[PDB]
DNA sequence: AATCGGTTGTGGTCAGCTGCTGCCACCGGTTAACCTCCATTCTGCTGCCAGCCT
């Protein structure tokens, strides 16, 4: 599936360019690698093509989930759980599940307590976290000017 | 004429509570997938075991 040169979007460290593929033996079998200059934390993942499905791998997502996350970013009635923790570890495993529409969900609701009241040194690194990995999908998904796809992100936000 | 003590017109003044009105430290209680063991030398005492005695 993948191609040197393709942009795919690893799940736990967004963006990630495909920039060779590997032959590399392990029990004797050249089990082929794919290797991702991601640029977080300047990382280089090295993955097999066989678990590129298992641990999740993912291309980036059309203009219908462009317009499917500007809906759900825009939507009401998002009650939550009034405990700390549980509310922690809930957009927590939300965040680490990959999806688009999740990472939009994570940062759409602390972005409105954060506007409601700033909550934590915690929660304020996992909205950093999360609102900087998807400005960097949006980014990708568009070829649309980093930081000025940051304003887009505040602009559709604030609404 | 002064001279040792009062009276005080009047203008600041200066901190001493007094509320008072926030507001900010400080301390207690709560959180419920699941996962169960860290150098040498001298002196004295205390415990070890064989070895004669009834």
Redesign the pocket.
Known sequence: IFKVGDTVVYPHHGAALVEAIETRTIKGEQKEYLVLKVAQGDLTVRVPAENAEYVGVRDVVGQEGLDKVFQVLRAPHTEEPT????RY?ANLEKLASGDVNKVAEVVRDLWRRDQERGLSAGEKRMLAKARQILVGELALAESTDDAKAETILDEVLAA
């Open positions: 405990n700390w923790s549980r570890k």
